[PDB]
């Protein structure tokens, strides 16, 4: 197989700027390279074939690669429509292999999260399952360490983390962190904490609640 | 010259087989290779193999050769790909491509689950707790199957500060979660209600989000 190496993995760009993604093949793929865009929720769209030929329809802001073993798709000036994951593919030989993609998101001034903590509902406890949910809303950038600490001690098992794709109204993102415990396992502990390390705030952002009453 | 049409979503049991279709339109079927590619969050894009509708030649990936069977039917200008002995690692998006143009995708979910309805659990803000210049309510729909599940907040009319997260899998079932950020001078008067509907079980629960000491 031909390890295909695409860098960066993700990038933070603004409308108007010049984008460059690179594709590196483990062998000479004889300019047998294709570039294509995956818009979230959609089937790939071909942009460039055999290293440098623009697919019909494609705007001329898009332009392609080199030869030998490293190739690039350059976007002259970035436009909104261009936000999706980009992927390169070699078809010089079988099997056919793809690069790991490059995700493009819109960039902004930093914004820190609004964190909210919710002890289990009575109802769910009355079924004997316990859910400690935590919401970390409207931050940017996308990097955020969510750490759960029960009565002081950090626990990392039984924790689901769902992410929101970068909102298109405010260019911010935000997760939902959830600890799950049983009724017996929740009522053995007292203090429950929601811990966040986020850039822009040097020290962890913590919300919390006590099972006695905080 | 035009496009490719894939068959709709498949919800199959482990141990079972499926057959995806790729009808081709607007060109000469037997002149252009059709290939099958697989998409997943872990591995991303993966090529299963290719068929030549005209020569009947096929090229398989060594990863899927014991599990994939590529066929084509000239008469109906449809590519078939058959996936057998289904396992939980076959859950994914499968595309048929002619390299320049692509089908829209066929979602295949392999699952041993049964129709299960959600538990919508109202998420009350710590009641014996702190305040600020805004209040965030919440809602939890834990344990359903299959997807989807559309939830709304005050029937889609209270939706400027709404957040709904993609449905995660746990224990074989789905759990989704939603968050509304409303003005701190609004909640207890103007009530906020979480509306949750699970078609498949034909259930529409409405849970009152109410405070509690």
């Amino acid at each position: 197989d031909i390890k295909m190496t695409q860098s960066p993995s993700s990038m933070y760009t603004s409308l108007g700027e010049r984008v460059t993604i690179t594709c590196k093949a483990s062998q000479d793929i004889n300019s047998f390279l294709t570039w294509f865009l995956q818009k979230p929720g959609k089937s790939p769209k071909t942009l460039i074939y055999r290293a440098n030929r623009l697919m019909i329809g494609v705007p001329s802001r898009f332009s392609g690669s080199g030869s030998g073993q490293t190739y690039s798709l350059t976007i002259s000036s970035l436009e909104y429509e261009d936000m999706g994951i980009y992927y390169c593919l070699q078809y010089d030989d079988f099997p056919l292999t793809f690069g790991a993609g490059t995700k493009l998101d819109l960039k902004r001034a930093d914004a820190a999260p609004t964190v909210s903590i919710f002890p289990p509902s009575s109802e769910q406890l009355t079924s004997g399952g316990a859910s400690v949910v935590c919401f970390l809303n409207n931050f940017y950038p996308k990097e955020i360490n969510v750490k759960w600490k029960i009565d002081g001690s950090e626990r990392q098992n039984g924790v689901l983390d769902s992410w929101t794709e970068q909102d298109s109204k405010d260019s911010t993102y935000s997760m939902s962190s959830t600890l799950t415990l049983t009724k017996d396992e929740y009522e053995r502990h007292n203090s429950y904490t929601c811990e966040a390390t986020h850039k822009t705030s040097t020290s962890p952002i913590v919300k919390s609640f006590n099972r006695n009453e905080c | 010259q035009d496009q490719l049409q894939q068959s709709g979503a498949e919800l199959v049991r482990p141990g079972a087989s499926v057959k995806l279709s790729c009808k081709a339109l607007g060109y000469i079927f037997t002149d252009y290779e059709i290939h099958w590619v697989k998409q997943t969050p872990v591995h991303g894009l993966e090529w299963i193999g290719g068929i030549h509708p005209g020569s009947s030649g096929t090229a398989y990936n060594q990863k899927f050769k014991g599990k994939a069977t590529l066929t084509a039917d000239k008469s109906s200008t449809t590519a078939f790909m058959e996936l057998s002995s289904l396992t939980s690692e076959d859950s994914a998006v499968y595309y048929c491509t002619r390299k320049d143009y692509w089908g829209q995708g066929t979602l295949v979910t392999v699952s041993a689950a049964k129709t299960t309805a959600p538990s919508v659990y109202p998420l009350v803000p710590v009641c014996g707790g702190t305040t600020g210049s805004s209040v965030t309510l919440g809602c939890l729909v834990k344990g359903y199957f299959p997807e989807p599940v559309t939830l709304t907040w005050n029937s889609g009319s209270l939706s400027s500060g709404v957040h709904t997260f993609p449905a995660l899998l746990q224990s074989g079932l789905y759990t989704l979660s939603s968050s509304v950020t409303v003005t701190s001078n609004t909640w207890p008067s103007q009530t906020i209600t979480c509306n949750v509907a699970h078609p498949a079980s034909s259930t529409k629960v409405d849970k009152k989000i109410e405070p509690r000491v």
Binding site: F32, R50, Y91, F94 | D31, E33, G50, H52, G57
Partner: peptide
């Protein structure tokens, strides 16, 4: 069969 594209073919 996409003559212009070149590259691997099943033939």
């Amino acid at each position: 069969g996409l003559y212009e594209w070149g590259g691997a073919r099943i033939t």
